[PDB]
Short mmCIF file of C-alpha atoms and ligand atoms in Angstrom, two decimals:
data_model
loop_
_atom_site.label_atom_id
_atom_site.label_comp_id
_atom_site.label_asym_id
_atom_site.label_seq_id
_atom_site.Cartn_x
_atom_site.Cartn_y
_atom_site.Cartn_z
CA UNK A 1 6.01 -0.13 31.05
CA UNK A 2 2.68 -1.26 30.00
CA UNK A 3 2.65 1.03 26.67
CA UNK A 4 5.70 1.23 24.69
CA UNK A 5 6.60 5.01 22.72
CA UNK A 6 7.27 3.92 19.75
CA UNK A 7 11.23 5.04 18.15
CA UNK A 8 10.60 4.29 14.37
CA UNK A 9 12.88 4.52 11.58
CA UNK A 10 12.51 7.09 8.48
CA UNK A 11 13.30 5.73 4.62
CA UNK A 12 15.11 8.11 2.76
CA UNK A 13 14.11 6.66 -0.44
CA UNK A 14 14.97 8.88 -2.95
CA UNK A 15 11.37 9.37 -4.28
CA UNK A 16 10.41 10.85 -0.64
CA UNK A 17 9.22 14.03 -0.16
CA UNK A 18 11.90 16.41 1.34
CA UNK A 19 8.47 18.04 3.49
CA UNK A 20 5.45 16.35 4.50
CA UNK A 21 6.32 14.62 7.21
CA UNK A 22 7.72 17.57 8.73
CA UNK A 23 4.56 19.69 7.89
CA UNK A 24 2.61 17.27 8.77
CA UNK A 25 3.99 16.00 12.07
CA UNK A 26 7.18 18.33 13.14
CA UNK A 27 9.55 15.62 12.24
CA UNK A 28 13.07 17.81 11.81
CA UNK A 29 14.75 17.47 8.58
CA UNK A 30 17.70 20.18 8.79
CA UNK A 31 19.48 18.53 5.67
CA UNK A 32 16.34 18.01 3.33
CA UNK A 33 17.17 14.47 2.79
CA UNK A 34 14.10 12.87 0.91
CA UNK A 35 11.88 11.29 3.12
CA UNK A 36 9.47 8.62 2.29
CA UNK A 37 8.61 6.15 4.47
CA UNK A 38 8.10 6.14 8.30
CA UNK A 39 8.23 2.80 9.81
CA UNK A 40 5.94 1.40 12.57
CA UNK A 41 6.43 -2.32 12.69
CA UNK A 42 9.19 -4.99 13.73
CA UNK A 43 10.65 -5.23 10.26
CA UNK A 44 14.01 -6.30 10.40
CA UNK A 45 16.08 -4.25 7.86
CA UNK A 46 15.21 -1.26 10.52
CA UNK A 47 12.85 -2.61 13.20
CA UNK A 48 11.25 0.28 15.47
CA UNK A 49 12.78 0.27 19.21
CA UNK A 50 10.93 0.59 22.30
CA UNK A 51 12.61 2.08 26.12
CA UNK A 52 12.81 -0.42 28.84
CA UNK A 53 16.48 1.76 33.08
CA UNK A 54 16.26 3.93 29.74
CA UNK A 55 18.08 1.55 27.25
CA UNK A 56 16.17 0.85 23.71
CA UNK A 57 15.75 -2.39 22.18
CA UNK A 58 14.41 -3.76 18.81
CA UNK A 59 11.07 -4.27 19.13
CA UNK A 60 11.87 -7.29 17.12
CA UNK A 61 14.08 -8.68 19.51
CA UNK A 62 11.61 -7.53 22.69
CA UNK A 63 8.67 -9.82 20.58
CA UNK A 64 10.97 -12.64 20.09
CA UNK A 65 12.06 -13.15 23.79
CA UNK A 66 8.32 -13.10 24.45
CA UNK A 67 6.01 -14.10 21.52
CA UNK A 68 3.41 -15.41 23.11
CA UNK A 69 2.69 -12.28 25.40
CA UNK A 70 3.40 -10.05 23.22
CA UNK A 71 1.99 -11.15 20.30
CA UNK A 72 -1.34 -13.19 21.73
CA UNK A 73 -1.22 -16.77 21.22
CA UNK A 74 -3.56 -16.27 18.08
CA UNK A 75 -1.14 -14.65 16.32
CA UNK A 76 2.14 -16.22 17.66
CA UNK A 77 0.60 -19.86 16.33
CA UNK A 78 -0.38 -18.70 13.22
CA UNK A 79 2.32 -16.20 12.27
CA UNK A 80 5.21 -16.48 14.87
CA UNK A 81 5.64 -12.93 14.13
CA UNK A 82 4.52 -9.60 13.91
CA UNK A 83 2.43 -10.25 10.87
CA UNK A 84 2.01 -6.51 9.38
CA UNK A 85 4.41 -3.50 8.84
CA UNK A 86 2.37 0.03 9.31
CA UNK A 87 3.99 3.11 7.15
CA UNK A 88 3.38 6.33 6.42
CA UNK A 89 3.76 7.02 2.98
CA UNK A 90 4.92 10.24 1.26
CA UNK A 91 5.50 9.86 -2.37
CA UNK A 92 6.51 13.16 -4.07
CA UNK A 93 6.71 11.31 -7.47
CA UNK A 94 4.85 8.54 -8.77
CA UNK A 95 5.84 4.78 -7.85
CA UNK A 96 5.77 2.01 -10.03
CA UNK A 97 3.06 -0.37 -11.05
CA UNK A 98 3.00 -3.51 -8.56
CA UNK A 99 1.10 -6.87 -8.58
CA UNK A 100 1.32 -8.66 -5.50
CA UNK A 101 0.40 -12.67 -6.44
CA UNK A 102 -2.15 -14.39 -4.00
CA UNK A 103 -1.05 -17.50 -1.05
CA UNK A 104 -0.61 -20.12 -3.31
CA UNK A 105 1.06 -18.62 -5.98
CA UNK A 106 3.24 -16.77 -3.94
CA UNK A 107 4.35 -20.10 -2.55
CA UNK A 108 4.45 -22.39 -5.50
CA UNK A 109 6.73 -19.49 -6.92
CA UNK A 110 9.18 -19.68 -3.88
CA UNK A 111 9.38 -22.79 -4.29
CA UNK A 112 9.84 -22.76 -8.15
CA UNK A 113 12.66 -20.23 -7.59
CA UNK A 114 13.93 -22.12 -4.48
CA UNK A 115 15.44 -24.82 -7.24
CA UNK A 116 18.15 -22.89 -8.62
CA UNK A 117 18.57 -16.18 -4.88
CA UNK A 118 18.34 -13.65 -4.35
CA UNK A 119 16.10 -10.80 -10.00
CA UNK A 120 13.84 -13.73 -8.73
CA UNK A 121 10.13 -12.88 -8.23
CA UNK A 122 9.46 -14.72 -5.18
CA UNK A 123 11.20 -13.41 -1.95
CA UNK A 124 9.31 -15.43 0.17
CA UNK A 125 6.04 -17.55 0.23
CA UNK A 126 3.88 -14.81 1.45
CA UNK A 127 1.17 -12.99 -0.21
CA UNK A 128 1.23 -9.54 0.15
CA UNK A 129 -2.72 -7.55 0.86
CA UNK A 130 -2.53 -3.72 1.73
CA UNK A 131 -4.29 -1.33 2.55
CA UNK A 132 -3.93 2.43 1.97
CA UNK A 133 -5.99 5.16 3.60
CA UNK A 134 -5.45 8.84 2.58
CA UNK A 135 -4.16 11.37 4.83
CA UNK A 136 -3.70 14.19 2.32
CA UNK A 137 -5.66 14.05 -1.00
CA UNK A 138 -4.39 10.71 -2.65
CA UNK A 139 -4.08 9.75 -6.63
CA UNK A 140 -3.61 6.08 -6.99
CA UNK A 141 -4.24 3.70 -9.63
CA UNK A 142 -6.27 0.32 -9.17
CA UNK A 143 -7.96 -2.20 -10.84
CA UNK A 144 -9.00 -2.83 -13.90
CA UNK A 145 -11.73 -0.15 -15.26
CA UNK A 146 -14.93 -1.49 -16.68
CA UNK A 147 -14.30 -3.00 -20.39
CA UNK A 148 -16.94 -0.59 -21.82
CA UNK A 149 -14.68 2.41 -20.10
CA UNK A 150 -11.54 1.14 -21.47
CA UNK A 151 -13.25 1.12 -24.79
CA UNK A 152 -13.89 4.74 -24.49
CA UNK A 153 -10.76 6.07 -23.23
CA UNK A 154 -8.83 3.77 -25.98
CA UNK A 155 -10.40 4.94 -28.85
CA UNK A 156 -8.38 8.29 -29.15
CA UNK A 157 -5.31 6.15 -29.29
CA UNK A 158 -6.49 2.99 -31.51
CA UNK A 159 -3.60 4.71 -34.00
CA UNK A 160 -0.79 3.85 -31.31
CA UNK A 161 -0.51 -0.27 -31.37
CA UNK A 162 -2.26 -3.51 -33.41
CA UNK A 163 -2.88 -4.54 -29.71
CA UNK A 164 -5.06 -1.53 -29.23
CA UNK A 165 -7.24 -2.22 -32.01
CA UNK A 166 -7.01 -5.72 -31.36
CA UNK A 167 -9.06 -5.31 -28.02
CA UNK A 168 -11.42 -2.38 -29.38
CA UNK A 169 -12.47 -5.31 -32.27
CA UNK A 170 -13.69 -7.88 -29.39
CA UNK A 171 -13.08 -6.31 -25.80
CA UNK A 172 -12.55 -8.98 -23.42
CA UNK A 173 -10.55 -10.64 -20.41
CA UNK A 174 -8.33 -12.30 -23.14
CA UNK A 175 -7.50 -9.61 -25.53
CA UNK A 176 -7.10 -7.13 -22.29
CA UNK A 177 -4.79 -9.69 -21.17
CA UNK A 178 -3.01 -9.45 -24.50
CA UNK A 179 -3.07 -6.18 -24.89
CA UNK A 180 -1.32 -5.13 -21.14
CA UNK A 181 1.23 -7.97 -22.46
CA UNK A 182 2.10 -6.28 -25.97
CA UNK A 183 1.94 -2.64 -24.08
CA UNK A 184 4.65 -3.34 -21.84
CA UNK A 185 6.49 -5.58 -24.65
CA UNK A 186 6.64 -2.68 -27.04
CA UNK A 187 10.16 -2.27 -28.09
CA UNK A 188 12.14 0.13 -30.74
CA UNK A 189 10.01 1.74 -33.57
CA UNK A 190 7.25 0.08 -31.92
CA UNK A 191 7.29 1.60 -28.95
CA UNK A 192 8.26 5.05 -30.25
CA UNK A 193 5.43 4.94 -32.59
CA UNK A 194 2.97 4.42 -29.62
CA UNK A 195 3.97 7.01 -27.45
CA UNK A 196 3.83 9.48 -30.39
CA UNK A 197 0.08 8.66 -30.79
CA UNK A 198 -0.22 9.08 -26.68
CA UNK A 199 1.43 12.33 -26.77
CA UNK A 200 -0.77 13.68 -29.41
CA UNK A 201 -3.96 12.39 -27.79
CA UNK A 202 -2.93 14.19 -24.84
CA UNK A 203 -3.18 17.81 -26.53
CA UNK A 204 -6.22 16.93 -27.78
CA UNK A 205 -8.04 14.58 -24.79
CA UNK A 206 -8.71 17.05 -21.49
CA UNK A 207 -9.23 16.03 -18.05
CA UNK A 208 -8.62 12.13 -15.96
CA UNK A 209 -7.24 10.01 -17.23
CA UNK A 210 -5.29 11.93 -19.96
CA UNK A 211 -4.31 14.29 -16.86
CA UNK A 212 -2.63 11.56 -14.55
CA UNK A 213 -1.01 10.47 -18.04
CA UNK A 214 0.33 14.06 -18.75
CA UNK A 215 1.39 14.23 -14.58
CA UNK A 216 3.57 10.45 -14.81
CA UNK A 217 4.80 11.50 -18.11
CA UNK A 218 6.96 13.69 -15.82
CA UNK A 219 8.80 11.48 -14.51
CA UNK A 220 8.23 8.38 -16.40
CA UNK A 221 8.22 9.99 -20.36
CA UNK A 222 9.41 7.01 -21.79
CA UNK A 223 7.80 4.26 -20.44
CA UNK A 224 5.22 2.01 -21.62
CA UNK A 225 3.23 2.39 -18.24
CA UNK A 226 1.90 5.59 -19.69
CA UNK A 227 -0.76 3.60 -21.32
CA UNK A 228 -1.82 2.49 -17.87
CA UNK A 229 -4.11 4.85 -17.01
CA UNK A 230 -6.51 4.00 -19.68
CA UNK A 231 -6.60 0.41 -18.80
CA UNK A 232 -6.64 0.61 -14.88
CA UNK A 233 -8.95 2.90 -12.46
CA UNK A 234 -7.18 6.08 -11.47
CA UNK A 235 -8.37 6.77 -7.82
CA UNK A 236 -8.26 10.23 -6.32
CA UNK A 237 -8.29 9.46 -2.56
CA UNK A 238 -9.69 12.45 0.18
CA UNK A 239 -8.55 11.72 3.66
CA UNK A 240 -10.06 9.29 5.48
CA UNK A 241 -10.95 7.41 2.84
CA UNK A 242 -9.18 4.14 2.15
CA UNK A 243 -8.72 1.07 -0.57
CA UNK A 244 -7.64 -2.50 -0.31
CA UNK A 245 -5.27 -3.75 -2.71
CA UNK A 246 -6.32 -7.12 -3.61
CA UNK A 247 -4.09 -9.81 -4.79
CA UNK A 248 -3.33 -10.23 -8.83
CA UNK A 249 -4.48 -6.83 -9.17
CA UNK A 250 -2.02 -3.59 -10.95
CA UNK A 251 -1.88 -0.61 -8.85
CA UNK A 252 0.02 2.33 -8.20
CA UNK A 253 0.64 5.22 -5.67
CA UNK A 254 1.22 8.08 -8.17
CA UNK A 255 0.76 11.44 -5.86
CA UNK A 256 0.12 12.06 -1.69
CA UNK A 257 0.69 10.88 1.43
CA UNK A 258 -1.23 7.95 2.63
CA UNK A 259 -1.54 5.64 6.01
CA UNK A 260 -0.27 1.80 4.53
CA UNK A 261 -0.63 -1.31 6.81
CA UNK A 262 0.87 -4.80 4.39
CA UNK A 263 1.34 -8.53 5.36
CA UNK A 264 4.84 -9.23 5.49
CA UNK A 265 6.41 -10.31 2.27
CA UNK A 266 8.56 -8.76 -0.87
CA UNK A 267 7.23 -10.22 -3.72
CA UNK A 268 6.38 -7.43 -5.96
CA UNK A 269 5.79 -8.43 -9.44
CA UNK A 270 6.46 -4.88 -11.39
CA UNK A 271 3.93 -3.75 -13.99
CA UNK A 272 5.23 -1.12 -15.79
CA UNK A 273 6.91 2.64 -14.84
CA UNK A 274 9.90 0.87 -13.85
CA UNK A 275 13.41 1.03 -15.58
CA UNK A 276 13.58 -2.43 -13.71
CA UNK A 277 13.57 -5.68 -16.22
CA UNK A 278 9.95 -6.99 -16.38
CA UNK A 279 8.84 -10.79 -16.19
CA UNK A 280 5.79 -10.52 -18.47
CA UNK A 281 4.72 -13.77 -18.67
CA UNK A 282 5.37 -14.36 -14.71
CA UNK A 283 3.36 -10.93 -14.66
CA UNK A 284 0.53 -12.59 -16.36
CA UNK A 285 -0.17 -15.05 -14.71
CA UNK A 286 -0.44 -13.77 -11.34
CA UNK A 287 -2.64 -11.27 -12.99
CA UNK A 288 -6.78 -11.41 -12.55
CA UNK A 289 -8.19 -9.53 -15.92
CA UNK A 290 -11.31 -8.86 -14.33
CA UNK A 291 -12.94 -4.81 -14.07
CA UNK A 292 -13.51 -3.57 -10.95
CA UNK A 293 -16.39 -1.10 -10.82
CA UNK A 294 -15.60 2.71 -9.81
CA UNK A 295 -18.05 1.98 -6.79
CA UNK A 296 -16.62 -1.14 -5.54
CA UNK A 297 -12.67 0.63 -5.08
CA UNK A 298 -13.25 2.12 -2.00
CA UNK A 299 -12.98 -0.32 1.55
CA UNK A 300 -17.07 0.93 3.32
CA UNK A 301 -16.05 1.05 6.82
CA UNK A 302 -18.33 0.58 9.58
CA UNK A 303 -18.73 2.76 12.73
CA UNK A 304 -19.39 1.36 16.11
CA UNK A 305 -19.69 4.01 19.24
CA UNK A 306 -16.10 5.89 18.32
CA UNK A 307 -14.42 3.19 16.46
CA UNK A 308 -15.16 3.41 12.70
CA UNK A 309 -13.36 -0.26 11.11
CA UNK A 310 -12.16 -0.91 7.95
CA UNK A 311 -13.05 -4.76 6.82
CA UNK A 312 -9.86 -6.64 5.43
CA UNK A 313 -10.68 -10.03 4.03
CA UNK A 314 -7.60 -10.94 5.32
CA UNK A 315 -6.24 -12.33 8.60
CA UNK A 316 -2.96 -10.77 8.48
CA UNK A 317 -4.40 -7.49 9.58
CA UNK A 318 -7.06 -5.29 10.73
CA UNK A 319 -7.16 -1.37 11.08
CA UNK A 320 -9.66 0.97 12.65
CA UNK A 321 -9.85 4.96 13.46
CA UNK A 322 -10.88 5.91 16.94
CA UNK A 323 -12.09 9.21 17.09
CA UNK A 324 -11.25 10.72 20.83
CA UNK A 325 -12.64 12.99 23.52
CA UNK A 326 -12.94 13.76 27.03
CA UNK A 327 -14.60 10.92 28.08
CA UNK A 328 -12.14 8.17 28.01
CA UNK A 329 -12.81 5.13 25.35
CA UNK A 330 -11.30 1.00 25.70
CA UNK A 331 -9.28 -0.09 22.94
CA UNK A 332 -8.95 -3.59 23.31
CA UNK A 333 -7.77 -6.53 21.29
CA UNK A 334 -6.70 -9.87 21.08
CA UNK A 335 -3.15 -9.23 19.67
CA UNK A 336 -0.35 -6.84 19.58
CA UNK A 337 -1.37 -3.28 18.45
CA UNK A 338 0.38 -0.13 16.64
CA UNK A 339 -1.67 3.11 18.16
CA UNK A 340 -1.10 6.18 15.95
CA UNK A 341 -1.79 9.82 16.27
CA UNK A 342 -3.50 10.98 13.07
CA UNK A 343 -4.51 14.62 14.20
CA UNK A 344 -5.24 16.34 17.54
CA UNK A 345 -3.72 14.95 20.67
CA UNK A 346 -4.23 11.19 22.79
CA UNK A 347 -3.49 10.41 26.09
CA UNK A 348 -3.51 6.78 26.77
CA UNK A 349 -3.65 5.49 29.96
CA UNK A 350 -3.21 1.69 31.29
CA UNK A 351 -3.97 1.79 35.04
CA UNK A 352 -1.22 4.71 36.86
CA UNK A 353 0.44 4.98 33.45
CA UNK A 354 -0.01 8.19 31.37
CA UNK A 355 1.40 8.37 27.84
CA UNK A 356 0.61 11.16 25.68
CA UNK A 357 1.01 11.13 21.58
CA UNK A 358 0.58 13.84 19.36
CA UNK A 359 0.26 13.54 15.35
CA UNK A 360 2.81 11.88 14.16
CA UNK A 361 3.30 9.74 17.37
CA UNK A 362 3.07 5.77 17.82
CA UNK A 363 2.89 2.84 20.96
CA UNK A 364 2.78 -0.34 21.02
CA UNK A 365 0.24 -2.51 22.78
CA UNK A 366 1.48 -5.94 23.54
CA UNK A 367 -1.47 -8.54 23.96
CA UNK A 368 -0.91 -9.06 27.42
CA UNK A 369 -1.71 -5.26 28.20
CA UNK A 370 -5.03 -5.08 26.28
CA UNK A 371 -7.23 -2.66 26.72
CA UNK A 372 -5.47 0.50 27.31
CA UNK A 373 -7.98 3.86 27.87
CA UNK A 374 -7.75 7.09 24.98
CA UNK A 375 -9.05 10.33 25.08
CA UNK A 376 -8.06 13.24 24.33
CA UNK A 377 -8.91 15.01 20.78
CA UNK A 378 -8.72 13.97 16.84
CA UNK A 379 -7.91 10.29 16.12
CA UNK A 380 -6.23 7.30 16.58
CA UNK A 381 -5.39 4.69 14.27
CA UNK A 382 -4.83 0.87 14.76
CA UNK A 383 -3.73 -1.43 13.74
CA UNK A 384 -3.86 -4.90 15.06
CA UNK A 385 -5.58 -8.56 14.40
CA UNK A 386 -8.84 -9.95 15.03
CA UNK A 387 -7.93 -13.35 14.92
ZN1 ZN B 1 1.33 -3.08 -3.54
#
């Protein structure tokens, strides 16, 4: 068959949420296992399966027999892979804080580590750019705020650490850098005394951040991450909306459910609300104390006749929304593409071949069948490469 059904695997994760993807989408749950990731890709821990005389196969395996084809030779000769997983996301308690290092360093760390596996930071030589778009309302943390915000939301906690008022004497790249290093360092009395002056500002401080702090608190009440919010951008997503997570850059998924394409790779450097051993100085230096404006979180996408695009300044992946009706529209590309029903109904066609996807739903689009025909009502996503 031209277009592939997609059969894709569910994470249990313990921090999944026991209902939305059944509200959302139907998917049956009878036991109320958590559920908190659903897996569109060719990843091999659990790759999804496509139907050939009715057996399934790995749609790992079904690429590898037939790269080029399936793949495009773009992608085949840069990647020799699948180059992105695509998830849905449903996080019913905050995650922890992640840097993901760029290219180089991602490599010269593999390659550091390789000497001596696998506790060791680099998994693989692979840098690691997302990109999250919100299908329920979405609170995330990202980026450094603005030094001149950080000031501000600091000040009712200058009590709490010699780091804080450290930074509020000269606030800069360096002493942010030092104080995100001494916050997640804090140990003992030290640490104790902190998160007494935190807990106290939050009976007195009303509204974001103080409220995020007050909602991870929750789950994370003693962990030095609770500081976080006042240093980084706290991001309440609405759907549709969407954010790329550079490299060298702390961010968190602390509340929603959320569309998330990534390049392939593991290395996740952790950053705080964690019980997990942290590298700090590793940290460090794969992190880029630089303020992102409030303005500039957001990915601006651009719309074209029915497909709106969201830039990546990546190559790894690309990912656009096509909105359907009646009249049938091309979607067409270069490479292998995920198709995903986000709400309504799509019928995709490819010459005599009907296949119909409602929310929830996925197909994959080898190269070689490029463009296949949509309508229908709601919209698609994709995700694919432009290469
Ligand atoms: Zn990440």
């Amino acid at each position: 068959a031209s277009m592939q059904k997609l059969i894709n695997s569910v994470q249990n994760y313990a921090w999944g949420s026991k209902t939305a993807l059944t509200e959302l989408y139907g998917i049956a749950n009878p036991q109320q296992q958590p559920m908190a990731e659903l897996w569109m890709g060719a990843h091999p821990k659990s790759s999804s399966r496509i139907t050939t005389n009715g057996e399934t196969v790995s749609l790992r395996d079904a690429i590898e027999k037939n790269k080029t084809a399936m793949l495009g030779e773009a992608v085949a000769n840069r990647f020799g892979e699948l180059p992105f997983l695509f998830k849905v996301l449903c996080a019913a308690q905050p995650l922890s804080i992640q840097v993901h290092p760029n290219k180089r360093n991602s490599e010269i760390g593999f390659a550091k580590e390789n000497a001596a596996p696998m506790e060791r930071n680099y998994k693989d030589p692979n840098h690691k750019p997302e990109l999250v778009f919100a299908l329920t309302p979405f609170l995330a943390m990202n980026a450094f705020r603005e030094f001149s915000d950080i000031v501000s939301l600091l000040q009712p906690v200058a009590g709490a650490h010699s780091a804080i008022a450290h930074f509020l004497q000269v606030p800069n790249a360096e002493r942010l850098s030092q104080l995100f290093a001494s916050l997640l360092n804090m140990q003992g009395e030290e640490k104790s005394r902190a998160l007494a002056v935190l807990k106290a500002a939050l009976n007195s401080q009303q509204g974001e951040p103080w409220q995020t702090i007050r909602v991870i608190s929750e789950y994370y009440p003693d962990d030095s991450g609770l500081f976080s919010p006042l240093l980084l951008n706290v991001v309440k997503l609405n759907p549709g909306e969407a954010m790329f997570l550079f490299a060298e850059t702390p961010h968190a998924y602390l509340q929603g459910v959320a569309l998330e394409v990534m390049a392939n790779s593991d290395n996740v450097l952790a950053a705080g609300l964690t019980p997990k051993y942290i590298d700090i100085p590793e940290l460090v230096a794969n992190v880029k104390f630089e303020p992102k404006p409030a303005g500039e979180l957001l990915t601006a996408p651009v719309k074209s006749g029915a497909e709106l695009d969201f830039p990546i300044p990546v190559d790894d992946f690309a990912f656009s929304l096509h909105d359907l009706a009646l009249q049938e529209t091309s979607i067409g590309q270069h490479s292998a593409a995920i198709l995903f029903c986000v709400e309504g109904e799509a019928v995709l066609r490819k010459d005599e071949q009907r296949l119909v996807l409602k929310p929830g739903e996925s197909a994959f689009i080898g190269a070689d069948e490029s463009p296949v025909n949509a309508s229908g009502t709601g919209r698609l996503a994709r995700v694919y490469n432009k290469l």
